Amino acid sequence: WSVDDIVKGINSSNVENQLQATQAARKLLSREKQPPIDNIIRAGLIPKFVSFLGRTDCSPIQFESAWALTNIASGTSEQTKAVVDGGAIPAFISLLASPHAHISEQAVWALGNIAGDGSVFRDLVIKYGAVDPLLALLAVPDMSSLACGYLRNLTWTLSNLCRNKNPAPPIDAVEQILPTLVRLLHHDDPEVLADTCWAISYLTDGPNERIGMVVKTGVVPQLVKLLGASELPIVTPALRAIGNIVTGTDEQTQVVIDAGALAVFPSLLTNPKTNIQKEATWTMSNITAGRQDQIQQVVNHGLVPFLVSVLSKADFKTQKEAVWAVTNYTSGGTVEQIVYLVHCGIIEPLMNLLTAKDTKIILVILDAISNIFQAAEKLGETEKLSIMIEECGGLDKIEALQNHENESVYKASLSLIEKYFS
């Protein structure tokens, strides 16, 4: 078929010719080669597809037009906008209640593609009342009766409904969707668990009120369980949601610490995947930025040596998160805890990073060493620390920063040299 032929057929009076033309359009759109979505949009065929979506009499045309509109909305934002402007969102929401599962799930697919474009189309889909039907589909007493493919499609559409920011997902949709996500987190299918963890991650990435909403449901233990799964597609979003949660209040970080999350961090910090390592080190950093008892929990789990090792022998992107962990640890820790950090061998690997080209990280490192010097002052072992720093090559590297890398670093490095090394 050609675009002109399908245009003539879709506008024909025969319902059979209309169905044939819609089939040809769907086949052009589902043909793996670069679809001609732009041409089909310029043909004025989207309104005809939207009208077909309402033909309860003809299930084939409903399915074919929904498929074609799904494939059209899977492209650029302009094409998704063409679908949305054609009034496709209400039509798909109406189809959600279709007696045919294939059309209902094709509508779920299309609504997912639309809500994935951005936050505006997501808020529109929520505005036209798609949340409750979509969630009704999953509510079936036995979620196993709902085929794993259909359940995955529904979970993915819901994840897109919890995705994106500015504006953040509306409260009316989140208060509806969270319990279903709690239910789905207890399924045995990996592809559903990954999407559910990703949705929770989206929801926990923002104000502490949303983190508190997610926490008050009691799912943090199940997220910690998934944290130690063998499947990296599931571990990535779970580690990520936990890292987001630990960016909130001390009660929330204590919810995470109580769920036994720290027990998994020896494996995450020693993980081959560099992104897992970096995100776990960032989580450790935000945990060492908490109460003294939380830092003591980090120490009790024996994670300080692991941090020393990621600071000493890792990539720079993870070494920076290790530096942040060290700085927060020294900023909020007891004198005993800082003595422990030093006795674990943090001085040399921390100062061996002053040779980098990041003014920010250099200033943070210098703040850390200043905190350690303050602890020494409280202990009466300032000169011992000066000697140790000098012998580890520390004084040399702090002096090298007097080359006005930045006036900030110059004055910071000058302050230390005069206070303790002059």
């Binding site: 498929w67 094709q106 997912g112 994935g116 990435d205 992104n275 908490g290 927060n328 909020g332 303050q374």
Partner: peptide, 25 residues
């Protein structure tokens, strides 16, 4: 010494799910 603030994340897209999907055959 005073406790430091918690650093909110920086979003990454290393293995994010697909924002849009296409049905094919």
């Amino acid at each position: 010494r005073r406790r430091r603030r918690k650093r909110k994340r920086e979003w990454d897209d290393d293995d994010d799910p697909p924002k849009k999907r296409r049905r094919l055959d």
